[PDB]
Symmetry: C3
Subunit: 445 residues, 3 copies
Amino acid sequence: DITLLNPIVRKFQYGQHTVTLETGMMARQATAAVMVSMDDTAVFVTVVGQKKAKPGQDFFPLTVNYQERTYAAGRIPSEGETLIARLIDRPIRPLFPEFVNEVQVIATVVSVNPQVNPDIVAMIGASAALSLSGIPFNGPIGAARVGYINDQYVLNPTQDELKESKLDLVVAGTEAAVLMVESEAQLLSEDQMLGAVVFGHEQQQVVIQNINELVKEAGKPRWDWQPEPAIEKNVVRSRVLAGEPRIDGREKDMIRGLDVRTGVLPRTHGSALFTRGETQALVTATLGTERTDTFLFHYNFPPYEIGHGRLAKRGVLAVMPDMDKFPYTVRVVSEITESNGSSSMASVCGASLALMDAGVPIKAAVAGIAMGLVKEGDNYVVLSDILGDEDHLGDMDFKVAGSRDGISALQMDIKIEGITKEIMQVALNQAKGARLHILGVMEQA
Amino acid sequence: DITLLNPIVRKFQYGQHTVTLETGMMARQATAAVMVSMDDTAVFVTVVGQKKAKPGQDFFPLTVNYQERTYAAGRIPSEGETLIARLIDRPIRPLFPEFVNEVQVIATVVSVNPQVNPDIVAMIGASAALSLSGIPFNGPIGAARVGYINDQYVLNPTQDELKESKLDLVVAGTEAAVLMVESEAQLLSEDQMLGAVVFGHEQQQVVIQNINELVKEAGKPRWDWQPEPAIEKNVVRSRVLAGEPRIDGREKDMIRGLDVRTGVLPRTHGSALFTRGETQALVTATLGTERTDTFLFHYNFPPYEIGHGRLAKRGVLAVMPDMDKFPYTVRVVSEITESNGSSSMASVCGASLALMDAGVPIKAAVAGIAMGLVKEGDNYVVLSDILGDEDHLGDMDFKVAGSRDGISALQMDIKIEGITKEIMQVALNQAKGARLHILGVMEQA
Amino acid sequence: DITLLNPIVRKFQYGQHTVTLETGMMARQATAAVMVSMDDTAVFVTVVGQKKAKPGQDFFPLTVNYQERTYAAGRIPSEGETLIARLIDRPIRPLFPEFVNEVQVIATVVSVNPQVNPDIVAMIGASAALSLSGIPFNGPIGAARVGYINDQYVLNPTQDELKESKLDLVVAGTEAAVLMVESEAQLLSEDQMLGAVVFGHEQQQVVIQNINELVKEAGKPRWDWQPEPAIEKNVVRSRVLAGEPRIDGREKDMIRGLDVRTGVLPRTHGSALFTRGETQALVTATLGTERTDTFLFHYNFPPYEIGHGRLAKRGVLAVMPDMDKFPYTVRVVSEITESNGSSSMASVCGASLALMDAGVPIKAAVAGIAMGLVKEGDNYVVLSDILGDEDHLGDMDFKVAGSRDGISALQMDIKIEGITKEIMQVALNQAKGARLHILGVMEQA
């Protein structure tokens, strides 16, 4: 080579793979640019952010772009690639000091090894890049996928090691706390689902360590910017603790009445109307004889590319038939006739019903539930079946899907950091009962 | 089922099918939502409209969305679906009291029976929904498709009953008057084409009756809103009656000079330049060996998804060869090199020419003509071959396509309501001669 | 035919084809509309431009639309059609008097003969139309494609006469000077590449002559409009002559240091990082077993349909293997990780490297180079390897791609008109050495 260049290369071991960080050579005009690599699956992340904000619209323009290249795979030719841009956006957005100068993160997979998934590699890149960007960014985050094989947690399992796994769980967070979780599981227990979040959280620490050690070795100057010096509740967010709490002083283990109708539509193979509170979903299942999924899930939304519902799919997936036994392509559509935005934990329940109505031999019924948490000092309240307004509240909100015996899907967005464990278990164990309750009703239809 | 719910279900017979209206259960947060059904072909219409307008831009934001679902048909996967959103928008827009708070109608076919077309079912839904919406909406409209089989008008014929039919005509209107007509016909007479509009108008009455009876049983409070207290003609719209009338005091049976050129293009199978007045169309026909149409019609429009020209297609369709006799796929494109917006009644003539030039054995020549009507009190004037400015005038404008012996297509947008019949026949019979005149010229080329 | 009409038809011979101009019959409401035709390959160009400008944003809204029709080819169904809209926009934009009333040119191929390419036919149309449009337009331009067969320049060669040709070059300009050149060549010499630009420039004169003769016979009144009475350099554009010249007083034969890395990516068949100055390209080559190109070139650009890089393709194309010898589909992607906008003359170099790394038996290495020219009176300076800011300077900027022995691609945008030849040869011969220099470095990797 010719080499006028200076790339700084840090290389640490990770699980059984050797990660490798590299900055300084590519995209210099960019606030920060890193080439992250793991067993030659390489994502090239970039961070560019403003300089100065504009009239303070009082909002934070933050966008992340994940794009997978075909030459990356050695092939000749936005997907659910926007879903992975979702796994990058979720855990880093709240790591920004209370900020409105715009930032743009862009991960581009430039090389791929089918065994080493680029999605967590891209997170690490988004992590490193933002750290070197001296842009006000609370610490560095790590990223870890956790499987379960031969009954124990596994770090960043391969694409086919995942075949034996009963778990697929992604965790990202800081040295101090976990910030986001995306799990798909095989009806595993609240505890098993938790030995996962902590397992992976303890593992990311290696990543975070190498990043700060590299920000020292090459990281750019942290920008100064401290910031300036009209309705919101705090009040619902303040009577919130051992106070009655509001529109429907639902106690706090109250879940709301349901409406469960089956065979709602004439020419569909299966159907179910599920309405609980302000939300409503007309779910249908239709049988039939890229690719393949033989299990398809679609969302039709009302008026004026939500995949947080790949969640609903993950939620249902655990109960879908073995396929050698029910050989059919199954397609579930959830039509949200009405509501607040927040969900399908309801489309999970909806789908579970439609499928049954459709005559699909699903391993068990499945239901979804949205939980919430508020914590001041050390008095925390777990909210069961949170409604539209009980969110955007702060601290923590999570979702859980599953049958009567276990969890099929787990999602968590923890924004405060004083929450470690028994707490997370008080919550994750209350949500369990609240979930069995719902399954209780659905079972009557 | 579980049933916390209250759906109000009205069910009336219609022709030989049993329609069924249902409100109250689905989409409650919506101003109005109805599930209309006919022999298990169900459309779920919704109406949402503002609350208060904004600065009175002085325009009426009204949009309709028709969407057909694949699970509706029990299948695993905007079209001309926007054309059906056209059949809903046309007849209801003028039923709004002289209104600028925005309204949004959304029909979504949720179930389908291939025999019972969802398009008129969606109209009825848009009708019922808007009525229950207490939103200022002049009465309720009905909807009816009319066929001709064994020589007599038929109500909502099936998809294959339509195979024997020489007519396909859709009529929508109020208890008092017809508002819009979309017909395709087999060179049937002005009278036959009219026994159709009235036949179907008398039939919709059943629909309208059940709707008002249901608005009483469940309809929401009619909103109050009455409204406030700078160029337009009225003058052309006032000298309009037995006065000379304008830029080209075209009498009122005047049709304008034509320009008919054939074989205009070198490598096309057939071609024709048709220019009359300000409008001009370069039409071509190209032979060859979803789907199928073996007769295709496309519009290329000039500069800075018009299907009111499916009309031109319908206009031409009646003369296309039997296909066992001319076995070829025929594709007509109309390139509007110039004009006013208003048409292809000219692309009908254009196409008829191009096809002939292309050597396509069409049953006869076909021509299009745009008519217009103004009525104050009881003095009405029928305008032959209306031009760009003679429209947007008010009262009534209609189009007719066909050969020398009969009508192939009929379109009507009646906005005033004092027009019943001989009148419509004076007009529909004047347009006939005005049409034969044009065929007279085309025949020389 | 019926003929109320008056089309003015001028017909001149061109090379071995008979061109034909026609105005007056079609699109009369348009400022100017012409039907240009050559051996029955007809483009129908149209010109519409404003009337009056608006607040003088101080910019010139000029858009050109080239669209090829399928019925044009007698077939039943934006491309690189936007690239041909590029060959129309390039040579006419600078022919506008120093103008901000918006203009819109639209060429639509309405008939095609596979032998007579519509692209230069559309240019002539854009030429004629704009001339008749009396819109302030400096003279009339011609257009000519030049081949090389049996060792001599050829005028508008057929699609298959081009099979024997070592040249494909398009030139457009005024009676006085050449304005734009787009060439693809087979490693032909700077001189051969020049006997081409002048050959075709002398040939277009016929076109220009017939156009002015037709503007006289039918051209519309030239509009009056003369125009009104805050940072830009002139200074860099003034010290520019025999003065040191700037950020990096690069002499003026200086080309900047390079960074040449190969095998940069893990799972790609070939790869190369090429970084020179502010620009950087991560190029890759991937082998494999409409259509066909078996040589593909794609550009991935960074953040917030550039085909001036079909140029990079043309640049590389001359060295790609004979295909009977290397039978594989080759796909090159250029990922611009960073820069100024200006290029791939760098993706040419990048690609040449990636291909070599990929093991593709390319006939020789190839490199790209961006040149520039400034001229006041008769003192002109040729700038080698111009950078981001040395452009948008004025007078002339051009690019050249090729191996060590000859030119593979040549692009020129001449905006001033005092430049005739030795000058163009001083430049085109300096760029040659500057190009061999770069090949000198690449050869070390």
